[PDB]
Symmetry: D2
Amino acid sequence: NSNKELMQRRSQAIPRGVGQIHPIFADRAENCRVWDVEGREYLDFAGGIAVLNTGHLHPKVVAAVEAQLKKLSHTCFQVLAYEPYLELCEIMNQKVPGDFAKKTLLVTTGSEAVENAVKIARAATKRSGTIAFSGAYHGRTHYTLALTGKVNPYSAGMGLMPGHVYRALYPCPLHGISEDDAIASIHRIFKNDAAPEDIAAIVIEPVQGEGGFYASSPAFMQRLRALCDEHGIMLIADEVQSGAGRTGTLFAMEQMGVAPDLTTFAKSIAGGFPLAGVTGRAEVMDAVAPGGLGGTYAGNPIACVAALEVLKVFEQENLLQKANDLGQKLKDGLLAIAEKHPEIGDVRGLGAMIAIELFEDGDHNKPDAKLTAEIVARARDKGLILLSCGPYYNVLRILVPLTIEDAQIRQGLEIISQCFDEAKQ
Amino acid sequence: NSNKELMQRRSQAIPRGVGQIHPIFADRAENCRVWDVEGREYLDFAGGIAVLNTGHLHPKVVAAVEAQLKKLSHTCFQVLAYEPYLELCEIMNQKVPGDFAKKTLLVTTGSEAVENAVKIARAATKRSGTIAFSGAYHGRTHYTLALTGKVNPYSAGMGLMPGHVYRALYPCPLHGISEDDAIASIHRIFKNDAAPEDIAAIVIEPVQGEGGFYASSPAFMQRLRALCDEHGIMLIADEVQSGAGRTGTLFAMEQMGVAPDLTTFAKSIAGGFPLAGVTGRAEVMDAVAPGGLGGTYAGNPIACVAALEVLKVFEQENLLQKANDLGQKLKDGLLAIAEKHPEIGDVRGLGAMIAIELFEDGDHNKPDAKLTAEIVARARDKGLILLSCGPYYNVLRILVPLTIEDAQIRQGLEIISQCFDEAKQ
Amino acid sequence: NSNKELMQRRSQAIPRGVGQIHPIFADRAENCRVWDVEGREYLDFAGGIAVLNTGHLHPKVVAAVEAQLKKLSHTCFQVLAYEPYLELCEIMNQKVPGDFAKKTLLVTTGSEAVENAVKIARAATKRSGTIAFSGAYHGRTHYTLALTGKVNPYSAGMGLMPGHVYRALYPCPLHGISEDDAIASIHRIFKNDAAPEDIAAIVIEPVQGEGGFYASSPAFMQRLRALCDEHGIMLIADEVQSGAGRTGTLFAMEQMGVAPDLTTFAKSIAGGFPLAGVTGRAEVMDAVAPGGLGGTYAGNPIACVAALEVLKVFEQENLLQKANDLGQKLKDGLLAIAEKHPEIGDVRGLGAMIAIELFEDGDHNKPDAKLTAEIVARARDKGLILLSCGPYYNVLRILVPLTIEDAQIRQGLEIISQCFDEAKQ
Amino acid sequence: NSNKELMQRRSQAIPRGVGQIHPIFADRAENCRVWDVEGREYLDFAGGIAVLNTGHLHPKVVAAVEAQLKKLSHTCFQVLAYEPYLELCEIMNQKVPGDFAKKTLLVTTGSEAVENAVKIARAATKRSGTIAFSGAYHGRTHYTLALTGKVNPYSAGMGLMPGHVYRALYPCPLHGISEDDAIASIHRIFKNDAAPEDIAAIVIEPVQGEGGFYASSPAFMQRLRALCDEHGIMLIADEVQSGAGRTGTLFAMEQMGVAPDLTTFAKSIAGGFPLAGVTGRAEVMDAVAPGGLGGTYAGNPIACVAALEVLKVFEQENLLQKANDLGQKLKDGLLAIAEKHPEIGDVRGLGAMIAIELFEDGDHNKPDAKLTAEIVARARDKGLILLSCGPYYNVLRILVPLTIEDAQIRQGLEIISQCFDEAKQ
Ligand SMILES: *Cc1c(COP(=O)(O)O)cnc(C)c1O
Ligand SMILES: *Cc1c(COP(=O)(O)O)cnc(C)c1O
Ligand SMILES: *Cc1c(COP(=O)(O)O)cnc(C)c1O
Ligand SMILES: *Cc1c(COP(=O)(O)O)cnc(C)c1O
């Protein structure tokens, strides 16, 4: 009945390993609104971490889910197939950028998708190594933790994660890492630790999520594409977070001018239901022999119809266009707040994948994690749910549903504005 | 909308890597019945691979899920908590064997569950290695494929999986591997490849699933518990398939006389919805640092209320007792069929985790995979969905819902009988 | 100038990790005789661990070393070549078993030899994995420690050695490991952990050295050759200790009835000078890209002429024949002693690679390591230098120079006799 | 004989993997001169690759070797000890930089030295990972190949070498890598791939050998020392090539104003005889349990006395001072040449570890591997033996024995002078 009472029960029944950003227990929600067990209402700007681009319980999505719930919820596709799985795969084959034929594998979590994307690139190229970028995030399975460019706290006390994962530098001028540096950092790997003939794939987020909402430029992605082409290396675009419309296009790669060989997706693809997948070159996808791709819950029937409905909703409700409008509105509002607060050293973002980075006295060398965390706390006190990110915990991101109403856009910014103001005195 | 038609589309849009045991597209289901897209009815003895111990769309479970769909489907627990996740953890801490304080983490798939249990075991012991058994199955992520005692097809063509996973022999007298050999193979690892101080844990299925439905004796499990104790090794019981009441007790470990340090669960735990978790000795669970455990969909709201309801159903409908009664009825009918078919060299199983193993001319060293495959095919033509298993593909298992009707017990056995009779012709 | 003071100095200058079997400092030696700094004389039955098959400072060898010492000692072959290196390779190409063209590489230590043989096999098959046997010993580099079937003390406290090295069972009837068991253990790796297409080679000692002087039968070696042939796996014969004529033939494989794809050699090859090498099927040896192989001291000029002279000595002095007779005289006297002491549960060996194993009350399950240690200690008190081995340290081995004098043979046996009598007294 | 005839036999008996810089077969050598089988005389400016700082067959060294050759050549220190080994360890413990107690392990090759240094660091810190630098060279065993910052052609076709080796950038202002970049690259590893608590050691060459004769500054070495101190990481200085006086001090670290925890040495330590070793902080060296450190040839008797004699010679003949004088003469000579040849973009070196780097049209971005190779070829025709190096094969190094006469210094410079003039014609 009370948040604290539940937090106490949480401390006795659940390990501390599982962090709790907001010590609040949600009871119900709708679109951009969430009510806790105490009846307090909050404006959701986190969206279950980019999972709710269509909002909490989108009515069209729920109706689809209820219909399937009347038919069946599980059989395990590998044993007995079913249409929602097949249908979504065909739709994904069409929506993911690429003029060649694609095939889609459905799993359940983003971690699984990345895991499987890599397995596939290995079977296709008959190579074992992979390259990932600094500040990257790909999941919490041993292998994805190795791909993830961040050790603490995910691996603390555990020891070293799986080898044969090499680290390249993600391009980021704001912090002195040029596109030439990033590209140079890959050749360095080829020259020092693993030749091209041993690299199955280069995994990259078109727009890093946990890494701080940093976007790759089309130019860079084009260089990366040519580099992979030259070495028979599979380009894996991890769009688990950037995908499903966040950047203004269904997939961020559509704005890069090049197509990846494989793409992983999840989170917002099903608008609040467990589903993930991999879509890529048909022949690369088919490199794995029959029986080598599976998963009990893979492509859960309910989640499949949810995803299918999410995609219809994007089309009928013009969410991509709104995503872009929202991003502009958000960026204009934040640049306005920025004028009165030098700590805001950057307002960026493609589509609605918006973020601001805080710096101690505008020094691009002094990340202000203290201010960042304070703003998140004050925002919560004012009924607004926020999340931070970045390898230094000084980036504030906005992952509010694309279905957000205009008045709620102003409300959220006004609250953010008040937080910075009150953080002065 | 015919099976053949849908299969053609399958080959065009989905990777062949995703095997298809039965070329049938299920449309709807109810308890033990499943109807395909052509309207044909089937008796389900596979159960979505031990995922439906409470049957397809159990009314109580479905009603709980429908109620929760009016509240919320996702927030990501680590950001905004919710009570169903918490409640399930409290209940699992009590239900999982072990007379000491315990804590639970919820994830989404069995693979993730095994992944996390190992991460936890590693953090608690400050060690990196792990020992798994021959014929074991633990998932399809890079690391769990290594734990999995089977390379083909699971990880074929992909190159070698993560090292620092050693292989022990699972006790199996039917095939000349005594418990002494099994215990001896663990010491062999200790002396030849990895000292006890480098082994965080020994992962074992109380009853092997894909491995052939081979059960560990209480005596053996007890020697294993003593061995882990002497060396400070965590005993991880993988109960993703043996759990959720399939053996007559909620968890097979209850029948072993000893408690593991960690236990993984999934599949039947939520009767048709994506959920999994890890329950273990509180001090071991707490070893991971704050923020080190987490996944986007982990402990999904809908899945949780579903799991809670499954637990209530087991109680209200006496499913554990029924599991045992069902198992005895099954083995007896199978033994009656064996009187007329030597090829059946063994009938076995705890509770309702039943299987029979085929041999050419009853020669216990001549796995009869051709016949096994023939029985599955014949069964399908008679409307019965079955699954085989075992390293040599000569084991037929029964994972029909525990909520099976008396008549369906007669029907499935009768069909099987006809299959052997019509094959012997 | 006393052994005691030198040992004290040793404790302050040299790491304890370097063990000292005998706390004696040798000053000079001749053939089978050794004198310590205190002028005491000993009979060497250890031969610097199978390094002095031609005895300490064989005059013909020394004369050759002296002649080369006037010319040059080092240029580094890969930079500026020299004849002794080339000539030795040519001779080894002829001497190593295998009725087909071969090429040879010279390195410096047995460890490097195994390292290179594996590198060569990997380039030749395009595979990364290897299989080695229980109780095997292949060197103390990271990789050769992974290949070695013994963790402590070789790796104690160091953590886990390089992965992708799988363990098979060495055939050993005396301890219940049948040949069928050995072969079956290889297929187990193929099924549970690494498919044949990922195994570049199987490394095996025709006769295990540190492992207990257990020899492989021709029948077994033949099955192994067949198995490797079927899968295109390189068979690597590690003859660093079994080679250089210790078994009656120059290389133990000659007595197996089949040829390995690669053979490693060191120790006795150069009668007490630092040299090692790898000899193998020409096509296989050529797989490595030009400039991929190298080592600074590799094929040291002085060690080469010593090796070339050692081979001449073997032919001119019929050491292969004397090896067999020495072996026979040793076994006879050891069997003689065995009749009075049941502890000696087995006398075995090919050529002069002779050993006896000790058990508590002839109980093949109670390895008498304590008695073994006592015998070594007692023999030392009597002026005889011996060495033990075997995973349980209950194996006494004789590695006395093949050039030993008949009276010394009797002398040696008498001492061993006296040791057993006085121990059991 | 004929060089070419010997080369033909070489191509038939030895694998192409063993490259041949100079297609010449040496017969005799002395100090700085080498005579091939055709009787042709050459001035040696490569020194067997920095193995002959005291020149070919230094008379004092040969005499000691002959004296030991009359006593014994091998017993294997672990079985029976001998004074030469002990004496060398005692002397290295005091000469190797480090104001604290040290212990020394003697092995045989530089590769083995690095292998053991890492093994020791791992046992001492109880961690498994290591960090190495770009362009580094540490040996050709699997593990040292992983430490080595160059894949082709060492690893070609073999697949990926051992994991858990992370790449840092070596400071090299000439090519755009600042010391800040170098240190930053280490923190990048701590943040992205391996936490400090998992890093047992950071391996570095005070002056990179094969990497291009690029030296670390005291300032940088001091920052590195401070970083290691802060995390309890062992700083291993691989002075196999930089050691034994090449830089003007016995070890290059002396000039860094800071001491390493472990130092590996080989090459010139024994002036042309197979010997290598590890000298480091005593408690660290002793972290390995007895029996854990070994090697058959380790600390070969003859090589030990040669090494002890080399040490006396440096003192008696003032080679350290001569190394600095020689370097100054070479650099002055080379600078004069560079006044007429723009392709020479840099003249550098500590003591007598001298090198010049070649660029096309004097552009640091355009390495001239072709000119470099031409100079080597022309130099040889003129009777001068040279070696090149660097990741882009455009670096000419000088490793002539420190015992060279002024006339020969002038002669070598003149020969090099002509090559450039004649290469531009
Ligand atoms: C969220 C995330 C994941 C991991 O997905 P899960 O559904 O939590 O297993 C993978 N990749 C990226 C880019 C992510 O943001
Ligand atoms: C089914 C299974 C798994 C993996 O579960 P998924 O939900 O398919 O990822 C793990 N271990 C065992 C024992 C299983 O049978
Ligand atoms: C002695 C031995 C080695 C290691 O040789 P070293 O010269 O000490 O490196 C390798 N293999 C076997 C079979 C050995 O007995
Ligand atoms: C030469 C070298 C080595 C390898 O030593 P070897 O005697 O060839 O095995 C190791 N480290 C460095 C710095 C070297 O240049």
